Amino acid sequence: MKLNISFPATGCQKLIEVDDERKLRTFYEKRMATEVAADALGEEWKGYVVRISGGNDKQG
Amino acid sequence: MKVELCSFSGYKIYPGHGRRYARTDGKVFQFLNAKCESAFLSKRNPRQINWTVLYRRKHKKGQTRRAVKFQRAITGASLADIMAKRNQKPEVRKAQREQAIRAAKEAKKAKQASKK
Amino acid sequence: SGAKFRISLGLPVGAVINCADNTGAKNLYIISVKGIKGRLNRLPAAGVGDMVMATVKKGKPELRKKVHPAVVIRQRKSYRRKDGVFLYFEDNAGVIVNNKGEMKGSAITGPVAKECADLWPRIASNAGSIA
RNA sequence: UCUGGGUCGGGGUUUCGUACGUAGCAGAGCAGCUCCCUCGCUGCGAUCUAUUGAAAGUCAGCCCUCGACACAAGGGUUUGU
RNA sequence: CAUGGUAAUCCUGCUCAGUACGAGAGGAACCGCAGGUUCAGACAUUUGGUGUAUGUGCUUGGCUGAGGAGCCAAUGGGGCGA
RNA sequence: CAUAGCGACGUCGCUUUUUGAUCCUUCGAUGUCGGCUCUUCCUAUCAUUGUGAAGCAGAAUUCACCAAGCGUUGGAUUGUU
RNA sequence: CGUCGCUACUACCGAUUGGAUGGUUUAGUGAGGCCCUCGGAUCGGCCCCGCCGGGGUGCCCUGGCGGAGCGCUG
RNA sequence: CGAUCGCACGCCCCCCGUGGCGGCGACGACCCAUUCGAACGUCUGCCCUAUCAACUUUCGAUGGUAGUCGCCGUGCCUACCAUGGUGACCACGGGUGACGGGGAAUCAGGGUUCGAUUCCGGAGAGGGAGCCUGAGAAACGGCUACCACAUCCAAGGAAGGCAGCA
RNA sequence: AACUGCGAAUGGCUCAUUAAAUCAGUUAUGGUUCCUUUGGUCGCUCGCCACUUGGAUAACUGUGGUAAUUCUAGA
Numbered sequence: 001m002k003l004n005i006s007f008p009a010t011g012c013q014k015l016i017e018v019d020d021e022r023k024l025r026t027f028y029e030k031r032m033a034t035e036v037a038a039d040a041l042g043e044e045w046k047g048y049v050v051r052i053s054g055g056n057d058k059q060g
Numbered sequence: 061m062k063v064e065l066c067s068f069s070g071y072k073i074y075p076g077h078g079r080r081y082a083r084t085d086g087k088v089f090q091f092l093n094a095k096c097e098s099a100f101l102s103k104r105n106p107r108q109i110n111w112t113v114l115y116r117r118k119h120k121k122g123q124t125r126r127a128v129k130f131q132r133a134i135t136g137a138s139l140a141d142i143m144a145k146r147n148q149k150p151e152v153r154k155a156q157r158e159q160a161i162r163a164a165k166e167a168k169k170a171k172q173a174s175k176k
Numbered sequence: 177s178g179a180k181f182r183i184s185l186g187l188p189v190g191a192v193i194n195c196a197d198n199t200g201a202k203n204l205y206i207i208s209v210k211g212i213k214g215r216l217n218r219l220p221a222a223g224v225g226d227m228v229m230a231t232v233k234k235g236k237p238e239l240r241k242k243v244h245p246a247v248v249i250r251q252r253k254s255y256r257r258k259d260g261v262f263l264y265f266e267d268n269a270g271v272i273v274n275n276k277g278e279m280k281g282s283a284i285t286g287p288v289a290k291e292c293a294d295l296w297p298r299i300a301s302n303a304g305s306i307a
Numbered sequence: 308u309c310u311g312g313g314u315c316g317g318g319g320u321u322u323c324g325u326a327c328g329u330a331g332c333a334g335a336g337c338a339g340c341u342c343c344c345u346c347g348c349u350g351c352g353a354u355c356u357a358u359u360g361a362a363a364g365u366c367a368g369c370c371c372u373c374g375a376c377a378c379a380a381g382g383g384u385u386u387g388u
Numbered sequence: 389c390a391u392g393g394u395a396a397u398c399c400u401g402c403u404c405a406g407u408a409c410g411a412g413a414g415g416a417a418c419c420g421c422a423g424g425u426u427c428a429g430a431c432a433u434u435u436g437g438u439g440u441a442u443g444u445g446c447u448u449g450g451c452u453g454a455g456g457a458g459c460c461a462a463u464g465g466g467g468c469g470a
Numbered sequence: 471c472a473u474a475g476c477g478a479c480g481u482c483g484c485u486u487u488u489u490g491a492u493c494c495u496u497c498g499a500u501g502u503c504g505g506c507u508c509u510u511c512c513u514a515u516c517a518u519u520g521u522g523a524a525g526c527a528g529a530a531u532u533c534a535c536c537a538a539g540c541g542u543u544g545g546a547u548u549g550u551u
Numbered sequence: 552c553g554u555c556g557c558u559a560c561u562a563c564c565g566a567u568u569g570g571a572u573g574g575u576u577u578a579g580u581g582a583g584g585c586c587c588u589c590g591g592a593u594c595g596g597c598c599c600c601g602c603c604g605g606g607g608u609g610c611c612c613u614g615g616c617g618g619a620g621c622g623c624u625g
Numbered sequence: 626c627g628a629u630c631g632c633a634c635g636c637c638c639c640c641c642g643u644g645g646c647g648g649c650g651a652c653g654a655c656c657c658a659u660u661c662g663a664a665c666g667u668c669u670g671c672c673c674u675a676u677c678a679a680c681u682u683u684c685g686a687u688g689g690u691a692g693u694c695g696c697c698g699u700g701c702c703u704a705c706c707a708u709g710g711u712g713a714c715c716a717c718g719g720g721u722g723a724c725g726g727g728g729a730a731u732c733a734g735g736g737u738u739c740g741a742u743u744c745c746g747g748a749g750a751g752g753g754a755g756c757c758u759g760a761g762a763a764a765c766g767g768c769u770a771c772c773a774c775a776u777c778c779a780a781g782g783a784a785g786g787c788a789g790c791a
Numbered sequence: 792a793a794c795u796g797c798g799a800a801u802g803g804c805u806c807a808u809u810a811a812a813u814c815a816g817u818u819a820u821g822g823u824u825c826c827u828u829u830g831g832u833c834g835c836u837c838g839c840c841a842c843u844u845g846g847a848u849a850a851c852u853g854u855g856g857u858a859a860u861u862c863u864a865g866a
């Protein structure tokens with residue numbers, strides 16, 4: 001499950017290819033345009049709240 | 061731990077529970093039990109059955125202003141350049157606007173003097 | 177690959193199921209099931225993915241008084257799918273095939289059980305949807 | 308016995324599906340009051356809404372209580388190389 | 389443990405292998421794998437069946453002055469049901 | 471090419487799942503067809519296990535041996551066997 | 552001239568509760584669209600008004616962050 | 626009840642001196658007229674058939690009243706009324722190997738056959754049905770759904786309409 | 792390139808449907824609608840931006856998803 005993380009204040013969006021579903025289950029069953037504290041993704045994401053903004057199915 | 065599906069009643073269905081119904085038209089449903097299945101097969105509306113999730117959120121049972129804009133340097137001008145330009149408040153803009161007036165007056169009168 | 181697992185049968189000999197292909201038949205009267213050794217007094221019964229011998233009871237007259245192979249693609253009896261889901265369909269249906277497995281017709285109306293799909297690839301290609 | 312096991316009660320689970328009563332400028336309307344009111348008020352009215360995923364049952368062969376209550380070192384028949 | 393009973397059976401698909409063999413047409417087998425049939429012994433987590441828990445709604449006729457609460461109709465009928 | 475597989479003319483047997491022959495038991499009565507159900511037994515083995523032979527290249531088939539452990543089904547017509 | 556016999560052809564009757572194909576409909580189910588009544592996942596403005604703020608003079612011209620007014624609207 | 630765009634570029638200066646005027650257009654518009662039209666109406670005219678003589682009238686058939694809807698007039702539809710309407714001068718029904726006409730063939734005169742086909746009008750885009758947009762479409766070299774075909778797939782989906790020229 | 796405007800409802804093909812229906816002549820819209828062209832009209836109204844007001848979206852940069860399309864998402 002790739003992640004197109006993007007910061008509007010700086011551009012510099014990048015694609016991160018995670019493999020731990022435990023990191024992503026803080027996102028699971030959250031609608032779009034909702035803010036999730038992404039402290040479940042490693043230690044590099046502390047103090048970070050992120051907003052879901054879409055995605056694509058397995059079929060694109 | 062598989063996919064959790066939802067019923068006629070909207071309840072969460074766990075693996076090993078309930079049935080799945082595949083109609084000929086291609087739509088497929090799943091039901092938690094035979095109470096939910098029979099209700100669906102009798103064409104009873106889930107929004108009129110009190111214990112249904114659809115009823116409880118229709119009847120509302122049991123249940124801000126943000127604005128930020130950030131200044132960024134653009135292609136053609138650095139952030140230092142745009143800040144100094146937009147911070148000419150102490151009569152620097154007055155200096156530009158007064159040299160503009162004298163240049164406009166002297167150029168317009170000179171253009172009238174150019175012709176004869 | 178992997179062989180087909182056991183499912184609930186539901187359709188004995190003498191059951192009239194629908195005909196989901198465009199061959200011009202409206203139903204198939206099951207007269208026997210392929211691969212049934214059988215037992216005393218026990219009717220040979222078939223589920224989805226099973227080859228049967230069937231005679232169309234109504235439909236085009238050129239198909240009527242003949243015995244055709246057929247493959248059950250939908251069954252109205254619930255069957256367990258080795259992962260807890262008990263699936264059943266709105267109706268019993270089948271398609272007319274030859275002994276080689278290819279379908280006489282060219283289209284299938286309605287879903288097709290996954291067990292029947294991966295057992296008969298020629299049915300799978302013509303399937304509108306897989307249940 | 309470090310008590311025991313009962314009987315009620317409580318909680319849990321679960322089954323059905325939202326109780327009586329009260330309230331409503333909810334309600335097809337209808338019948339009575341019009342100095343009255345400037346759009347109202349007195350009754351009848353299936354049904355609807357809120358109280359209310361409420362009410363009711365749940366071991367008798369469901370689970371846990373240590374809450375209440377009484378009761379339990381008692382009875383009878385036998386048995387020896 | 390003397391003694392008595394005694395139980396498992398058969399098939400298909402994949403691979404071997406379009407191989408051996410054969411002029412060609414055709415066309416195997418052992419090892420291994422995945423499953424079935426008939427039989428047997430159980431079991432109820434799940435799906436289904438039952439259902440007088442006479443459990444809980446719905447409902448016809450009647451009956452208790454009415455509401456409420458119920459009851460009778462040899463299980464009144466019917467829905468869901470531990 | 472008699473004998474892979476067959477076997478005429480003849481001849482020797484076995485079996486009691488055919489049908490006769492007889493009339494020993496039963497006439498102060500042994501309920502007389504078939505089917506359904508259910509168990510067991512026989513082998514003269516249809517299939518399966520192990521084999522031998524062929525006019526057995528493969529496949530399929532046929533003959534024969536040890537062998538009855540297991541199996542031998544669903545139906546239309548007919549009271550039927 | 553007719554029956555009878557032979558050979559071709561063409562129609563007819565005929566069990567088959569025969570068969571096939573158009574078209575018009577009763578009734579049942581009913582995809583989809585449109586309209587109406589809702590619904591409100593979201594996206595904005597106003598009330599900003601906790602803060603440094605401020606100027607005709609604590610009585611803000613306001614420059615941005617920020618709380619959130621948990622209200623009024625599109 | 627113009628917050629639009631180009632073309633050459635000039636006039637007035639008293640109030641002065643920085644502003645007011647200026648020509649050619651282009652784009653635009655609510656409404657009127659015209660043009661291209663469109664739509665529904667009036668009168669008259671059609672092939673064979675009675676082995677089609679009574680049809681329409683529930684579910685509108687005929688008319689009235691009042692509405693809804695449509696661009697408008699009307700049973701177009703709704704409600705309440707009245708029982709009407711059409712037929713041997715052929716209704717109604719059926720068939721057509723029927724798109725209609727301008728026309729074509731044959732020719733004393735009268736007539737008889739053919740007109741799918743390049744002009745005019747109509748209809749249709751495999752069969753029906755429903756619509757978005759637009760002045761104009763029930764459009765199909767637009768969409769939506771069903772039916773009949775048929776396409777590619779990693780079977781998770783996606784995409785169609787030569788009675789246009791070949 | 793993309794937004795915007797226009798056109799794409801014309802042409803071309805075919806004759807299945809269609810028997811007072813279409814169509815031909817004739818007549819009406821005083822029962823209607825009409826892009827575009829052209830001609831009218833655009834100071835007729837008393838009523839701290841006008842020296843000109845606001846936000847997004849394209850195109851573009853950048854990250855992709857999908858076996859796949861004139862498929863498209865986030866920033």
Ligand SMILES: [Mg+2]
Binds near residue numbers: 216217
């Ligand atoms: Mg039997």
Ligand SMILES: [Mg+2]
């Ligand atoms: Mg209790």
Ligand SMILES: [Mg+2]
């Ligand atoms: Mg022993």
Ligand SMILES: [Mg+2]
């Ligand atoms: Mg045995």
Ligand SMILES: [Mg+2]
Binds near residue numbers: 448
């Ligand atoms: Mg009653």
Ligand SMILES: [Mg+2]
């Ligand atoms: Mg009562």
Ligand SMILES: [Mg+2]
Binds near residue numbers: 460
């Ligand atoms: Mg009594």
Ligand SMILES: [Mg+2]
């Ligand atoms: Mg009685």
Ligand SMILES: [Mg+2]
């Ligand atoms: Mg039941």
Ligand SMILES: [Mg+2]
Binds near residue numbers: 493494
């Ligand atoms: Mg004797």
Ligand SMILES: [Mg+2]
């Ligand atoms: Mg006797």
Ligand SMILES: [Mg+2]
């Ligand atoms: Mg005797």
Ligand SMILES: [Mg+2]
Binds near residue numbers: 500
């Ligand atoms: Mg006896």
Ligand SMILES: [Mg+2]
């Ligand atoms: Mg022997």
Ligand SMILES: [Mg+2]
Binds near residue numbers: 723
């Ligand atoms: Mg025609």
Ligand SMILES: [Mg+2]
């Ligand atoms: Mg013509």
